[PDB]
Curated annotation (Swiss-Prot):
Protein known as: Protein S100-G
Swiss-Prot/TrEMBL keywords: Acetylation, Calcium, Metal-binding, Phosphoprotein, Repeat, Vitamin D
Modified sites of kind Phosphoserine: S41
Recorded GO MF terms: calcium ion binding; calcium-dependent protein binding; transition metal ion binding; vitamin D binding
InterPro entries the record matches: EF-hand-dom_pair (IPR011992), EF_Hand_1_Ca_BS (IPR018247), EF_hand_dom (IPR002048), S-100_dom (IPR034325), S100/CaBP7/8-like_CS (IPR001751), S100_Ca-bd_sub (IPR013787)
Domain of life, source organism: Eukaryota
Modified residues (N-acetylalanine): A2
Family matches, as SUPFAM superfamilies: EF-hand
N-acetylserine: residues carrying this PTM: S1
Species this chain originates from: Sus scrofa (Pig)
Domain annotation EF-hand: ranges: 12-47, 44-78
Positions contributing to Ca(2+) 2 binding: D57, N59, D61, E63, E68
UniProt entry tagged with the keyword Calcium: yes
Residues involved in Ca(2+) 1 binding: Q25, E30
Length: 78
């Protein structure tokens, strides 16, 4: 919603990750889109669009795993 619920983000995340072979991560392209969807760079404070990606930039099939993504999630709602 205005604030993003864990279940909500989880559902969206699954929806995104399922676009790639492994429904467990989102590749750079997908993560970027997610960012755009949740808050299109209106980060008037925590300016990091990419620092957070890099800090979590794994690469199994896509990029950022659900495991790592949870750290991202924590900063969505604020």
């Amino acid at each position: 919603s205005a604030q993003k619920s864990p279940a909500e983000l989880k559902s969206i995340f699954e929806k995104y990750a399922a676009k790639e072979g492994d429904p467990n991560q989102l590749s750079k392209e997908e993560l970027k889109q997610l960012i755009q969807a949740e808050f299109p760079s209106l980060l008037k404070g925590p300016r990091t669009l990419d620092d957070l990606f890099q800090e979590l930039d794994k690469n199994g099939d896509g990029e950022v795993s659900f495991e790592e993504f949870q750290v991202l999630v924590k900063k969505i709602s604020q």
